[PDB]
Amino acid sequence: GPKFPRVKNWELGSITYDTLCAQSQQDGPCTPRRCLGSLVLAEQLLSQARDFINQYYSSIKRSGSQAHEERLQEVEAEVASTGTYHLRESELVFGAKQAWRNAPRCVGRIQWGKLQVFDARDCSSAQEMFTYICNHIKYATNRGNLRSAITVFPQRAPGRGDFRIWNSQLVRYAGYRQQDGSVRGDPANVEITELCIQHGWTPGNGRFDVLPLLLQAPDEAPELFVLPPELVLEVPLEHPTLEWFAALGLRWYALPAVSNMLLEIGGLEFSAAPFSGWYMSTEIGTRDLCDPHRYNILEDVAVCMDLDTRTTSSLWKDKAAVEINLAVLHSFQLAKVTIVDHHAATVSFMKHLDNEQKARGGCPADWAWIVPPISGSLTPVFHQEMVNYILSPAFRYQPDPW
Amino acid sequence: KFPRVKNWELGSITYDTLCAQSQQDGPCTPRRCLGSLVLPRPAEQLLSQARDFINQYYSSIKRSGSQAHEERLQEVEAEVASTGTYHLRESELVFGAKQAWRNAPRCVGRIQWGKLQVFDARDCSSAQEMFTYICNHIKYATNRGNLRSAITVFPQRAPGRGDFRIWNSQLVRYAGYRQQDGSVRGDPANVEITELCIQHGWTPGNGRFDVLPLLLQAPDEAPELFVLPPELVLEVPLEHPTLEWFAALGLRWYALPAVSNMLLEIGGLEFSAAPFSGWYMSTEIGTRDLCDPHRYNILEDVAVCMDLDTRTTSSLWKDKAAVEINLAVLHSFQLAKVTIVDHHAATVSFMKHLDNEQKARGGCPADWAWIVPPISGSLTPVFHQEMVNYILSPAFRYQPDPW
Ligand code: HEM
Ligand code: HEM
Ligand SMILES: Cc1cc(N)nc(C[C@H]2CNC[C@H]2OCCNCCc2cccc(F)c2)c1
Ligand SMILES: Cc1cc(N)nc(C[C@H]2CNC[C@H]2OCCNCCc2cccc(F)c2)c1
Ligand SMILES: C[C@H](O)[C@H](O)[C@H]1CNc2nc(N)[nH]c(=O)c2N1
Ligand SMILES: C[C@H](O)[C@H](O)[C@H]1CNc2nc(N)[nH]c(=O)c2N1
Numbered sequence: 001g002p003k004f005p006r007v008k009n010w011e012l013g014s015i016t017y018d019t020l021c022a023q024s025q026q027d028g029p030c031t032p033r034r035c036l037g038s039l040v041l042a043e044q045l046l047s048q049a050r051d052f053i054n055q056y057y058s059s060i061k062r063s064g065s066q067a068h069e070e071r072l073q074e075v076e077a078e079v080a081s082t083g084t085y086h087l088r089e090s091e092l093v094f095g096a097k098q099a100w101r102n103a104p105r106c107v108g109r110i111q112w113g114k115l116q117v118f119d120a121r122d123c124s125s126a127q128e129m130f131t132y133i134c135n136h137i138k139y140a141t142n143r144g145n146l147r148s149a150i151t152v153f154p155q156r157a158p159g160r161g162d163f164r165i166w167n168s169q170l171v172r173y174a175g176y177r178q179q180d181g182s183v184r185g186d187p188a189n190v191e192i193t194e195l196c197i198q199h200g201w202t203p204g205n206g207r208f209d210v211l212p213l214l215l216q217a218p219d220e221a222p223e224l225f226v227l228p229p230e231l232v233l234e235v236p237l238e239h240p241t242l243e244w245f246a247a248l249g250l251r252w253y254a255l256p257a258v259s260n261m262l263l264e265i266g267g268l269e270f271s272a273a274p275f276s277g278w279y280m281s282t283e284i285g286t287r288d289l290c291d292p293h294r295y296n297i298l299e300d301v302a303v304c305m306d307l308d309t310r311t312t313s314s315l316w317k318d319k320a321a322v323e324i325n326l327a328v329l330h331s332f333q334l335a336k337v338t339i340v341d342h343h344a345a346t347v348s349f350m351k352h353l354d355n356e357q358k359a360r361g362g363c364p365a366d367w368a369w370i371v372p373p374i375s376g377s378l379t380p381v382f383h384q385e386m387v388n389y390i391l392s393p394a395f396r397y398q399p400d401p402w
Numbered sequence: 403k404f405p406r407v408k409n410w411e412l413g414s415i416t417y418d419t420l421c422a423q424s425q426q427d428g429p430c431t432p433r434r435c436l437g438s439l440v441l442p443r444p445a446e447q448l449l450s451q452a453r454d455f456i457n458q459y460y461s462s463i464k465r466s467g468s469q470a471h472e473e474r475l476q477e478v479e480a481e482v483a484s485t486g487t488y489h490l491r492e493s494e495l496v497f498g499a500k501q502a503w504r505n506a507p508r509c510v511g512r513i514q515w516g517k518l519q520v521f522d523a524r525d526c527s528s529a530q531e532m533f534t535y536i537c538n539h540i541k542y543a544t545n546r547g548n549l550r551s552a553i554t555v556f557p558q559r560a561p562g563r564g565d566f567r568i569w570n571s572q573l574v575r576y577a578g579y580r581q582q583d584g585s586v587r588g589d590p591a592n593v594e595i596t597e598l599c600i601q602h603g604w605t606p607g608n609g610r611f612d613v614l615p616l617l618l619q620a621p622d623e624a625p626e627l628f629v630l631p632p633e634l635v636l637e638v639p640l641e642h643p644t645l646e647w648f649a650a651l652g653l654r655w656y657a658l659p660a661v662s663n664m665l666l667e668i669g670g671l672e673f674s675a676a677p678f679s680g681w682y683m684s685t686e687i688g689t690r691d692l693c694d695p696h697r698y699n700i701l702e703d704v705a706v707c708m709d710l711d712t713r714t715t716s717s718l719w720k721d722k723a724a725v726e727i728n729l730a731v732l733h734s735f736q737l738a739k740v741t742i743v744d745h746h747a748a749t750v751s752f753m754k755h756l757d758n759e760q761k762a763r764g765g766c767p768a769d770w771a772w773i774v775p776p777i778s779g780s781l782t783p784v785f786h787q788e789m790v791n792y793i794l795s796p797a798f799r800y801q802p803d804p805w
């Protein structure tokens with residue numbers, strides 16, 4: 001066969017070769033001696049810029065045209081006299097969509113072409129960031145008919161502070177460290193909760209208190225902004241057949257909006273570019289609610305179901321997890337809030353794999369993140385070999401700003 | 403250079419230094435990770451592999467650098483220099499087999515690595531003798547349902563000649579009969595091997611759970627067919643603790659998981675036939691064997707029996723049905739008094755193994771995709787555990803099917 005990785009689907013017996021990986025210009029963590037795939041975590045600028053501009057002109061089918069060459073020349077003159085450059089509006093739209101398309105850990109990529117891109121590169125204060133973020137949340141939420149969106153704030157500048165959203169998501173719940181060492185609310189958010197209190201937030205004392213936004217404009221202390229409650233759509237959790245589930249007082253928010261990632265486009269770095277879609281149900285039902293280091297509700301729910309929690313072989317954990325996941329799907333459906341189950345999501349991702357094979361000759365995908373955290377082998381992606389590599393434009397992790 | 407390995411449930415960090423002992427490259431590069439791929443795409447070489455292994459052996463018995471150690475290295479050197487090969491002493495073979503198990507990145511059951519019965523069958527000269535050895539292995543391993551880990555090692559590969567091979571991928575598996583209507587009766591994974599048995603003179607059954615005969619091959623000879631005496635093959639009828647109709651599905655599985663198609667590499671020597679067995683983790687049967695779409699694929703049948711809404715994925719009928727099947731497997735083996743481990747118990751014991759190996763060797767090669775169970779992934783501790791994957795020797799490897 002060809003000298004590119006051969007990729008097999010073990011359910012169907014079908015084979016593809018990935019040629020897209022040859023376009024990767026950035027090393028991952030693996031070597032021939034060891035695989036680290038399971039770990040979670042001017043001259044240079046110009047070559048990344050040229051590459052991105054070539055990508056943009058390919059995408060509009062004007063590669064090698066005089067407009068392509070003039071744009072290249074304009075970019076290197078900008079870099080020559082200023083040390084940086086700036087993207088045209090349509091280049092930014094293309095770049096943000098491409099960064100989503102390129103994200104190996106996202107099972108939702110069948111939607112990549114449908115992204116509302118808000119250009120907020122004229123933002124010049126924390127207050128204005130708040131306005132933009134509120135508008136994003138309003139547009140994205142759309143009273144339950146969720147729409148994928150990203151808002152892009154000004155790029156990093158040489159020896160000048162970054163725009164930063166300190167929250168890891170736009171909507172998340174507080175976690176309060178208790179006197180007895182335990183946590184009330186979401187244990188994932190203890191640090192950010194304590195930082196909001198330092199900066200003058202009067203905290204609640206519930207399990208599901210919406211955090212305020214800590215927003216930072218270049219070279220200034222972060223400023224605190226409470227989201228008006230009418231903007232934060234939430235879903236009370238109930239179960240279709242288990243009547244007591246509603247009595248548990250569980251709830252979750254409708255909008256998953258990642259706010260601490262760096263969007264990189266042609267060497268330019270947007271340190272604040274929060275993006276949002278809609279939930280896949282296992283994110284809430286399995287991870288947020290059942291992780292031992294999160295809300296950890298498995299045992300409480302199994303006790304309500306009268307399961308034998310004293311022994312592993314009753315599969316009490318598996319049974320309670322299924323019902324919690326069902327409650328999430330049912331509650332979001334009842335509230336008319338967009339949500340996708342892990343079966344439909346993974347089916348759509350397989351379609352996406354097929355699309356991308358035809359369009360680009362492959363699709364970078366991180367198998368451990370694509371396969372859902374319950375019922376892995378029951379979904380078609382479990383049986384699909386995947387090649388993981390870094391393409392640009394890309395979303396990247398960045399250090400917490402405190 | 404040594405990777406940081408973090409557990410995300412607990413916040414704890416270790417460093418894998420064992421990975422520096424790896425002499426054998428896997429499929430990944432800095433450009434792209436190929437970790438999800440199932441299969442991989444002379445004197446001086448053998449001698450250094452041999453020396454390394456002998457050094458491991460004498461080290462393990464705390465006799466590193468002794469007289470016995472030096473004289474043994476000379477024996478190996480003298481034999482390779484004259485013949486191009488050498489032979490292991492039985493105790494070395496025992497150490498090497500356990501080490502290959504210990505080193506196997508895709509095995510969640512490695513807490514048991516030190517407890518392995520090794521049958522030396524390197525004096526085998528016929529398919530007939532292979533059969534007697536396999537039969538003794540099965541009887542020993544099964545032990546009336548109180549399963550004991552075992553390996554039997556047939557003669558090593560030799561430069562001039564064909565391999566000893568077991569054609570079956572497992573000692574015990576069910577036939578798959580391709581039907582006129584294009585469907586498969588029995589196990590679709592075993593259509594090809596079933597057709598080979600028939601072509602070699604097997605009179606086939608026509609059931610869903612027909613135990614295959616063995617096709618055993620001595621060097622450069624046609625394989626020969628041997629039917630396992632039914633009394634040797636322990637099987638478990640599947641029932642459900644609360645759902646009475648489940649027993650009427652007529653479902654069953656065999657007690658003994660026994661891999662027979664992998665190559666055992668020790669000290670540069672290659673054992674092309676070396677079947678090994680332990681006991682089942684229930685998800686192998688309840689989730690993969692019975693529920694895989696390209697296997698028995700019973701999910702939909704079970705869900706309809708449970709009267710679940712199959713018209714829509716969001717009723718989670720697949721998840722619900724899969725749970726009850728796994729429960730049925732667990733209950734049925736426990737009732738039949740046959741050793742089995744559930745995926746929670748197994749993954750908890752694997753975490754303990756990782757801790758043991760950290761202290762003993764400075765790490766543990768592990769393939770995260772294979773260790774995390776196929777249902778209820780993040781509900782097990784291994785989901786939140788980062789893992790480093792690499793090839794240490796002694797090792798079990800895949801080899802081409804002999805046909
Ligand atoms: C439209 C519905 C969407 C669904 C169902 C979806 C689903 C997911 C899921 C399940 C993950 C794994 C997250 C985790 O477990 O930590 C993920 C990650 C990710 N998503 Fe999507 N997503 C959607 C939309 C979007 C959008 C609009 C963007 C940006 C334009 C995006 C970009 C990303 C990125 C960069 C990651 C990786 C984060 C990381 O590396 O930790 N997704 N997505
Ligand atoms: C004692 C109880 C044991 C349990 C519960 C157990 C469990 C498992 C499981 C669940 C797998 C993954 C299988 C798959 O999905 O294909 C596996 C693979 C493996 N096991 Fe263990 N095992 C046990 C004993 C043994 C023994 C005795 C040996 C050899 C001495 C062994 C060597 C291996 C090897 C080499 C693999 C990888 C096969 C491959 O790469 O396809 N295991 N084991
Ligand atoms: C846009 C979008 C849609 C969607 N359905 N889902 C998402 C991921 C959100 C929601 N549900 C989890 C959170 O993902 C947050 C991004 N990644 C977190 C993983 C991580 C990073 C660093 C250190 C760690 F330990 C872990 C985004
Ligand atoms: C010794 C032992 C104990 C245990 N519990 N479980 C086992 C694995 C056995 C049983 N249940 C599955 C089978 O695993 C067989 C090895 N894995 C096959 C993967 C494969 C897929 C496709 C092409 C290939 F070449 C290889 C062994
Ligand atoms: C250690 C392991 O890599 C880690 O727990 C990963 C596994 N797969 C995941 N997959 C998704 N989608 N999200 C996650 O947070 C994780 N966590
Ligand atoms: C493509 C993927 O690597 C393949 O389906 C693997 C995933 N993980 C697995 N894990 C185990 N234990 N057994 C398997 O057969 C597989 N299959």
Ligand SMILES: [Zn+2]
Nearest residue numbers: 030035430435
């Ligand atoms: Zn890798």
